[PDB]
Amino acid sequence: VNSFSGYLKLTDNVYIKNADIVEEAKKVKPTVVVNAANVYLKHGGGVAGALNKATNNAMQVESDDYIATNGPLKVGGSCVLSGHNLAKHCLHVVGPNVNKGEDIQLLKSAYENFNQHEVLLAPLLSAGIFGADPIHSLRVCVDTVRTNVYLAVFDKNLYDKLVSSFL
Numbered sequence: 145v146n147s148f149s150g151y152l153k154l155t156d157n158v159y160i161k162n163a164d165i166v167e168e169a170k171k172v173k174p175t176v177v178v179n180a181a182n183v184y185l186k187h188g189g190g191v192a193g194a195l196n197k198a199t200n201n202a203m204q205v206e207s208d209d210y211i212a213t214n215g216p217l218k219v220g221g222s223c224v225l226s227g228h229n230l231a232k233h234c235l236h237v238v239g240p241n242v243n244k245g246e247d248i249q250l251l252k253s254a255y256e257n258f259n260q261h262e263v264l265l266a267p268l269l270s271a272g273i274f275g276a277d278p279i280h281s282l283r284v285c286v287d288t289v290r291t292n293v294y295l296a297v298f299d300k301n302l303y304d305k306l307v308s309s310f311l
């Protein structure tokens with residue numbers, strides 16, 4: 145048993161809810177929250193900027209030190225950093241950004257990072273400003289992630305479409 149509430153079960157291991165991932169993280173304080181990161185860990189908009197804003201910019205300060213030491217992530221890659229006031233850990237995962245021309249086949253590699261963690265709160269990857277089709281992202285998630293993932297979908301209209309079209 146875990147603390148996640150109000151989710152619709154899609155599969156053995158994937159759950160979904162219409163929720164603001166920031167508000168969900170603040171309530172649950174999960175072991176792992178996933179950030180929809182870019183390779184520079186520049187948390188400017190969407191989930192990364194909202195997560196970073198909710199940490200009072202501490203996520204960005206930590207991230208800048210990580211990049212100064214290690215250089216950029218790979219598209220499809222990840223790093224584990226602090227969860228600050230939102231979670232124990234934040235798993236920063238880089239899905240391909242369609243609006244920058246990245247290979248959508250890298251979306252499966254991105255979701256494979258989730259399998260290193262038993263339970264995660266996470267948004268769909270490559271959605272919103274990354275330019276991928278969220279229906280596709282949910283299908284790759286279900287077909288790739290084997291650990292228990294709790295998906296927060298901000299947009300109520302999209303949530304309803306994801307559920308009603310789910311195979």
Ligand SMILES: NS(=O)(=O)c1ccc(C(=O)O)cc1
Pocket residue numbers: 180189190191192267268269270271272273274296297298299302
């Ligand atoms: N890639 S993003 O611009 O941060 C993004 C991620 C998820 C949602 C959503 O749940 O609706 C919206 C935008």
